[PDB]
């Protein structure tokens, strides 16, 4: 399965994996350190288990010799956490406090797992809670359906305007903004979306369960 948690410095090298980038700009690494060491509570990652987060190959623990046979060897001897997504987040630091999604990325093979959504909800909540951010703005190109749906529909960003010919190729942009309120961003708000019990944090959970089971 997939795990969702807060990014740390130990994640930033894993973020460079070519499976996470459409076009590779690997000179951004100091910029990544800069995020993680300036806003250390704002960024989140999605992970599965691995031996080397930098290895792009589906590495089969039960077939090593095939790796040696591929030249992955030292010519001398014979026989962790990968990111499947992440959100890199900052406060605007160049004006009410506002946050900025520097980078949102999910492996295509981990599509349809709700990863971009789960990551963004954590990031939005963090921006409000940790930095008291008042809003997040961004632009989306007119043809980028996945992104439009995620921000406008799933995350309920408001569309302020269509920026005409925003892009050099003539494409319009959707200028979007989400006003951040802590009570509205609480992750428990969305636990039953598109489908309602919740933990009250005061009840004795294990006791209540034992008593409920007694009914039947």
């Amino acid at each position: 399965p997939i795990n969702i948690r807060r990014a740390t410095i130990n994640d930033i090298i894993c973020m460079q994996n070519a499976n996470l980038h459409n076009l590779p700009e690997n000179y951004m690494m100091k910029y990544y350190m800069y995020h993680i060491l300036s806003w250390p509570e704002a960024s989140f990652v999605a992970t599965t288990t691995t031996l080397d987060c930098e290895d792009s190959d589906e590495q089969d623990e039960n077939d090593k010799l095939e790796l040696t046979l591929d030249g992955t060897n030292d010519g001398r001897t014979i026989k962790g956490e990968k990111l499947v997504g992440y959100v890199l987040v900052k406060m605007n630091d160049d004006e009410p406090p506002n946050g900025h999604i520097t980078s949102l990325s999910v492996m295509r093979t981990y599509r349809r797992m709700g990863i971009a959504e789960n990551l963004m909800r954590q990031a939005l909540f963090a921006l409000r809670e940790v930095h008291q951010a008042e809003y997040v703005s961004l632009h989306v190109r007119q043809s980028n359906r996945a992104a439009l749906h995620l921000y406008r529909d799933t995350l309920a960003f408001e569309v302020l305007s269509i920026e005409k010919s925003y892009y050099q190729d003539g494409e319009d942009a959707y200028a979007m903004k989400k006003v951040l309120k802590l009570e509205e961003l609480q992750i428990s708000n969305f636990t039953h979306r598109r489908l309602k019990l919740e933990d009250d944090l005061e009840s004795d959970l294990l006791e209540d369960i034992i008593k409920q089971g007694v009914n039947d």
Binding site: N3, T8, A18
Partner: protein, 733 residues
């Protein structure tokens, strides 16, 4: 005098680096300003140690400039001299009291030097100074220093109950001013656990789960706090309840899969977990349950096979195309994992037949055909997959490797050079570590290394139109070897840059107020040269470096009587061992943990540079973990013993007297076959690399090695010999 120094800094500040150096170099053959200038120059050129000496000198010559202590604290931090950074931090603090940054950085230095109470007092004093309702732009930093203080009190508390209770009261007091709630709650729960207050902990874990119900770790800690970690009935009920709170999340659905024993209940939870993913067409479905196949194979395999075959039997291929193809994709992976390759191919073919536009299917089918030993067909299929996304790095590399396995040299070369068509560059960038990720680069290094061995053999055969062919091949051998070495050498640059990126953060984190994050960066930087990818690149590059050394000596003995874009310079080096050390090995050795240290590598490295007492140390430490009957141990000892007979005289003695206490444990192979047996493949390979040294009978040795590889498929065996024996048979050139 001062003029020569400032001349250089100017020169560097322009870009004339070489002239800068000589100006500075002979300027040395002084003024506070002079020392300052040089300190700056040495920093700019990454001579941090030198920079520290020159900055200290500026001060010792009556420099009035107090910003020098900040320069020192930065440099001293970077090189790990925290004893002296503390002094610098204290000095700088005294001259610039009005900036919280200098208080935090002093506290951090005290904390790192083990002066925890002093660090605490430093932080507490500023805390008191900043009660006067801290402004909104100062609140974040204040929250961070409050939590950082708690960190130090938490560590100091250890397991002491009274001390822990006080850390908790402090934690509770600072909570309204701490905005890192995840951080605070996780700390709160941990303290609660250590106090034996498990019900309190469980409340916090339930709070953490509600804040992020997708984090597996909170669920496992919840179990321990509830004391039901071994209770299947109660765990079942717990996760059933948590599934109603959090129906979109994986941990309540997945964790019961790891412990349920009732066949019907497990089948049901497996169905509920897997089938909605298949119906959505989730490519990762199989990957998501693979850990269950890995840890509960015999139990879960039969259940999921039935579950997913049943599901498939209900799908209309034309009107349920997405479930159909992704269900076939799952079953293909299922039977591939079970090593039933014909069945795996049937299911992948059904998905491909239906929908041929999806790369995933070509990748999986090519792997299945590989396992069926159909190397050309597998490469062909992967190549079709490659046409669907010609810029994908993963499929570009995998396609190269497959054509190489199929011994299709021309196609491997063509596909491998796609992204580097011009000037061995990607889009104007010469230095690949600035544009590609480490995996693409190491894969290229390996591919070129293999392309190099291919040309190397063709040359040997030509030795036994033709002079033109030899000329063509001699040239391809250099090109492919250089490219391999050049690809490997890009890798260390990745990690050197990360280490050096730390420099600005020794002060920037203080100013931003992120001391906790800063300390994590420092631990991170101390481990950069031990990462899997770094270690992989180092060890694989090492065989090129060892062979340039070994083969030069070979050619030397051979001729005892006789009268840039493709890395040509790298492979003509006369100091291959020093090149390996400076580019790869020193930084790794400087950081590696003793329980992670590779003693075979250390032995073979120091053997080639003559340091024969390091060889002994490596041999000894190895035995202490792997035994004195291990084939590898016996091999190293034998080679070391022979060395005590070409190495430094006054140290062959030292080793011998160190080896005096291995006295209990001439044909040295026969001694090997009798005291160590002939089953340790790594022991045999080790002898093979030094067989003309000991000596070791090469024919009998090769036979043993080939016997030990009798298990493997014939084509695979060949590839092993090509990688592990060939390069040591015939010298390059």
């Amino acid at each position: 005098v001062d003029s020569l120094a400032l001349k250089g800094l100017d020169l560097y500040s322009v870009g004339e680096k070489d002239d800068a150096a000589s100006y500075v170099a002979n300027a040395i053959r002084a003024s506070p300003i002079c020392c300052h200038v040089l300190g700056i120059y040495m920093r700019n050129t990454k001579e941090y140690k030198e920079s520290i000496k020159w900055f200290t000198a500026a001060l010792n010559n009556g420099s009035t400039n107090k910003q020098i202590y900040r320069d020192l604290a930065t440099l001293q931090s970077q090189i790990g001299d925290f004893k002296n950074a503390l002094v610098s931090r204290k000095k700088y603090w005294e001259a610039f009291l009005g900036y919280r940054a200098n208080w935090t950085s002093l506290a951090v230095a005290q904390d790192v030097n083990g002066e925890r109470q002093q660090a605490i007092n430093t932080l507490s004093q500023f805390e008191k100074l900043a009660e006067g309702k801290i402004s909104d732009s100062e609140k974040y930093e204040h929250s961070e220093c409050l939590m950082y203080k708690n960190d130090i009190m938490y560590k100091a508390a250890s397991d002491n109950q009274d001390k822990l209770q006080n850390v908790l009261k402090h934690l509770n007091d600072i909570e309204p001013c701490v905005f890192d709630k995840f951080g605070l709650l996780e700390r709160k729960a941990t303290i609660y656990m250590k106090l034996g207050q498990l019900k309190d902990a469980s409340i916090v874990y339930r709070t953490l789960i509600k804040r992020n119900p997708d984090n597996f770790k909170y669920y496992k800690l919840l179990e321990v706090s509830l004391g039901i970690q071994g209770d299947n009935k109660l765990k079942k009920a717990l996760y059933g309840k948590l599934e109603q709170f959090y129906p979109r999340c994986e941990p309540p659905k997945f964790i019961p899969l790891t412990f349920l024993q009732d066949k019907e209940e497990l089948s049901k939870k497996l169905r509920e977990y897997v089938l909605p993913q298949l119906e959505r067409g989730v490519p990762a479905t199989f990957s998501n349950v693979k850990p269950l196949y890995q840890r509960r194979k015999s139990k879960v395999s039969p259940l999921l096979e039935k579950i997913v075959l049943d599901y498939l039997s209900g799908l209309d291929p034309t009107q349920d195309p997405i479930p159909f193809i992704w269900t076939n994709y799952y079953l293909s992976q299922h039977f591939l994992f079970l090593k039933d390759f014909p069945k795996a191919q049937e299911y992948i073919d059904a998905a491909l037949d239906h929908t041929p536009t999806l790369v995933e299917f070509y990748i999986l089918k090519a792997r299945i055909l590989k396992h069926l030993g159909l190397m050309d067909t597998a490469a062909g299929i992967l190549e079709e997959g490659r046409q669907l996304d010609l810029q994908d790095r993963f499929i570009n590399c995998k396609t190269v490797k497959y054509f190489l396995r199929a011994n299709n040299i021309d196609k491997a070369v063509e596909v491998a050079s796609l992204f580097t068509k011009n000037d061995d560059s990607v889009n104007g960038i010469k230095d690949l570590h600035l544009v590609e990720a480490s995996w693409f680069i190491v894969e290229q290094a390996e591919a070129y290394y293999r392309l190099y061995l291919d040309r190397k053999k063709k040359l040997d055969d030509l030795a036994s139109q033709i002079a033109n062919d030899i000329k063509e091949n001699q040239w391809l051998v250099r090109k492919y070897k250089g490219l391999a070495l050049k690809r490997f050498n890009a890798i260390p640059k990745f990690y050197k840059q990360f280490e050096d990126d730390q420099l600005d953060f020794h002060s920037y984190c203080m100013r931003k107020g992120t001391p906790r994050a800063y300390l994590e960066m420092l631990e991170w930087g101390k481990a950069l040269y031990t990462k899997p990818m770094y270690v992989r690149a180092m060890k694989e590059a090492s065989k090129l470096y060892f062979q340039m050394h070994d083969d030069r000596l070979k050619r030397k003995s051979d001729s005892l009587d006789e009268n840039d874009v493709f890395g040509e310079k790298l492979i003509e080096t006369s100091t291959p061992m020093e090149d390996f050390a400076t580019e790869f090995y020193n930084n790794y050795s400087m950081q590696v943990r003793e329980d992670e240290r590779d003693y075979i590598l250390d032995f073979e490295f120091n053997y080639r540079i003559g340091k024969l007492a390091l060889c002994f140390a490596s041999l000894n430490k190895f035995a202490k973990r792997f035994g004195t009957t291990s084939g590898l141990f016996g091999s190293m000892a034998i080679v070391l013993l022979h060395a005590t007979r070409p190495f430094d005289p006054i140290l062959k003695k030292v080793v011998t007297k160190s080896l005096e206490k291995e006295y209990s444990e001439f044909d040295w192979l026969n001694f090997y076959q009798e005291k160590f047996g002939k089953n340790d493949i790594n022991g045999l390979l080790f002898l093979y690399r030094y067989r003309d040294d000991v000596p070791i009978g090469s024919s009998n040795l090769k036979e043993m090695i080939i016997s030990s590889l009798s298990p493997l498929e014939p084509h695979s065996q060949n590839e092993i010999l090509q990688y592990y024996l060939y390069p040591y048979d015939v010298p390059d050139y």
